Amino acid sequence: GEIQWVKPNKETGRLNINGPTRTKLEPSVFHDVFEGNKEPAVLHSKDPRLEVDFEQALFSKYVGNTLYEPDEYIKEAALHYANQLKQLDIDTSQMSMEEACYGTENLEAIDLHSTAGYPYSALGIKKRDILDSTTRDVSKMKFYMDKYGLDLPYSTYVKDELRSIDKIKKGKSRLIEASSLNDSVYLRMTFGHLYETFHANPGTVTGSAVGCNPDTFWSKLPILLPGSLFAFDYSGYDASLSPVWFRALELVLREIGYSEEAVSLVEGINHTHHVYRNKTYCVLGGMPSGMSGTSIFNSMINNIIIRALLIKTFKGIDLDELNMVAYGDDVLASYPFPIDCLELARTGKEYGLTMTPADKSPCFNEVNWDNATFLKRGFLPDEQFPFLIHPTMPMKEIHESIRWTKDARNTQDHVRSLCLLAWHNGKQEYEKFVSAIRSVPVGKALAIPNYENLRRNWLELFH
RNA sequence: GUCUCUCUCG
RNA sequence: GAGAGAGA
Ligand SMILES: [Zn+2]
């Protein structure tokens, strides 16, 4: 992805889009019970902790574009992935506006608390003024679709969240690039049925884990990914995507039967305009972060990428023996023989992709079930039923979370949520966690899940 | 102040 | 109907 131009909003006529510049994050009553280094992300150019120019740090993720047109490898990769999707029998017909707004069994209703985006946000119109759960009204939505149309700019907000000290000094805050309600509705009508298929079928046929619940999904993954594992990290995946990957996605959507009218929406993703503060800017390439379908299309593009990388770097790859699941840029894959990701990464750099080792070291070391991570969780067989796999979240991450709060009124829910993640690390580590929580007065006031009930609730998910 | 999952409360 | 947490 590459910024093509930046203009004042005076010159483009776009409304200003401003988000909060003060963090809601404050130290919690556990701030000194646990160790951690993270602090709230920089939200303002005048943050005293910055050691670089903030806005330049924010937009450095757009590293440029390399390829624009699919080569032979990307074409074969796209066709192989699309052929695989055919068995799912995706409904390529347009989803009704009423389903698209108010939801189906496998597609959540449009959230009425998340932004309506441009221009409704700037004008002061919330979604509750357009959409109504009770009435399932689509009349006003049709009106506003006609009034403001489509290809509206993406509203850019900085995300208020914890970050490591290094990312605070270098201003590497993360951006939400929120699509207008009109484009969301339009994308959900065009692809809502494919979204349903993906949400209902996380696994190695979609090649996607969007919609999975890790508590149950983890036990399927060693069976879905037989053989030798491979995985790696991307640096700035979404923003590094060149236009070739959107051309490749068009190839996939066409081959599984989408109308040219539907396929034509992809160029509106490849080429997007954004408003941040009082400026408009054009981005060519790059996936917007707050678009309807960001995770799914990121995941689909990843399926094309891994296939293309394999057949370009190695001779004799049989793609039918590849198994992979992606959640956006996060990937876990397997193949009958070990795959050298040092070579995959070399090829990836030609495509404009920066790929680093999974274990965060400088060397591409072996990935196996004892060290693999997906969605930030490891894989730990249950000691009693070894076919049941615990998703393990490192206590370090849980420790970072519990030391801060955006509203100490919600301390109980926050601590409970963390306990539901923590117990998978085992009884000893969990009770150590609970003991520390209970070492301060507020901790003695909280209802904390008992390990045995947690484990028994989990086992019952498998019936 | 994006989506997915999970939990909690009327 | 409202709130939170984590992940991407
Ligand atoms: Zn443009």
Residue numbers in the entry: 1 to 463
According to the publication:
Building on the previously established methods in assembling enterovirus RdRP EC and in capturing various EC states, we used an EV71 RdRP bearing a C291M mutation in such approaches, since the equivalent PV RdRP mutant (C290M) was shown to produce higher quality EC crystals. Building on our recent work reporting an enterovirus 71 (EV71) RdRP EC with an intermediate conformation of its template-product duplex, here we report three types of translocation intermediate crystal structures that define multiple nucleic acid conformations bridging the pre- and post-translocation states, both in the regulate forward translocation and in an unusual reverse translocation induced by pyrophosphate (PPi) and divalent metal ions. These structural data, in combination with enzymology characterization of the RdRP, highlight the key role of RdRP motif G in controlling the critical movement of the template RNA strand that is probably the rate-limiting step for both forward and reverse translocations. A striking common feature for both modes of translocation is that the template backbone, in particular for positions −2 to +1, stayed fixed relative to its starting point of translocation. As we pointed out previously, this phenomenon is probably related to two motif G residues (T114-S115 in EV71 RdRP, “G” symbol in Figs. 2d and 3d) that create a hurdle-like steric blockage right at the +1/+2 junction of the template backbone.
Among these mutants, a class II mutant T114S-S115T (abbreviated as ST) yielded EC crystals that are suitable for structure determination. This mutant has a kcat value comparable to the WT but its KM,NTP is about 50-fold of the WT level. The much lower NTP affinity could indicate the alteration of the catalytic pocket at the NTP binding stage. Interestingly, the ST mutant-derived EC structure indeed exhibited a previously unidentified conformation with the −2 to +2 template nucleotides clearly occupying intermediate positions, while the product strand almost reached the post-translocated position (Table 1 and Fig. 5, S6M (C0) structure, 2.1 Å resolution, C0 indicates that the intermediate state is in an NAC prior to the corresponding post-translocation state of this native EC). Although the nearly full-register movement of product strand had vacated the active site, we did not observe NTP-like electron densities in it, and therefore the incoming NTP-assisted translocation is not evident. Previously determined native enterovirus EC crystal structures all adopted the post-translocation conformation, and therefore it is probable that the hurdle residue mutation relatively destabilize the post-translocation state, allowing the capture of the observed intermediate state. Comparing to the pre-translocation state, the template +1 phosphate moved by 2.2 Å toward the upstream and residue 115 backbone amide nitrogen interacting with the phosphate oxygen also moved 1.7 Å accordingly.
